[PDB]
C-alpha cells in the first residue's frame, strides 16, 4: 500500500496530457459536465495514434514542464502511509 | 544468441517498443487512471 493519493497531475506521459488537457478543458467551460470514462478515454486512444508527430509532441514537451514541475514538489513531498 | 536480426523480425506488432505497462483490464484506464486522476479528472459531491 504505497499509495501517496495526494500526488500532483504526474509524470504522466503525452498521451495521458492529450486526454488531460481535453477533459479538463471541457470541464472548466462545464462545470456540470462530466464525461463517460470507457467513451472519452477510447475516442482518445484512438484519435491520439492517428495524430502527427508534431502534435504528439507537443503533448510531449508539455508533460516535460509538469515532470519537472512534479520533481519540484516530489522532494517537498511526504508520502501518506508510504510504505 | 546467433540471432542479430532474427529477434527483431517479429517486432512489426503494434508496440511502442513495450516500455509501458499496457491496462488489459480496462481501455478506460489507458491513459488517466483512477487511483491518481479522481482528484482532479473529475469533481463530484459523491458517486
Request: hydrophobic share 30%.
Amino acid at each position: 500500500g504505497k499509495g501517496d493519493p495526494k500526488k500532483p497531475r504526474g509524470k504522466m506521459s503525452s498521451y495521458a496530457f492529450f486526454v488531460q488537457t481535453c477533459r479538463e478543458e471541457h470541464k472548466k467551460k462545464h462545470p456540470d459536465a462530466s464525461v463517460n470514462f470507457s467513451e472519452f478515454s477510447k475516442k482518445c486512444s484512438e484519435r491520439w495514434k492517428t495524430m502527427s508527430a508534431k502534435e504528439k509532441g507537443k503533448f510531449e514537451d508539455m508533460a516535460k514542464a509538469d515532470k519537472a514541475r512534479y520533481e519540484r514538489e516530489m522532494k517537498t513531498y511526504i508520502p501518506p502511509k508510504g510504505e | 544468441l546467433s540471432q542479430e536480426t532474427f529477434s527483431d523480425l517479429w517486432k512489426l506488432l503494434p508496440e511502442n517498443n513495450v516500455l509501458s505497462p499496457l491496462p488489459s483490464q480496462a481501455m478506460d484506464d489507458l491513459m488517466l487512471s483512477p487511483d491518481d486522476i479522481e482528484q482532479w479528472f473529475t469533481e463530484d459531491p459523491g458517486p
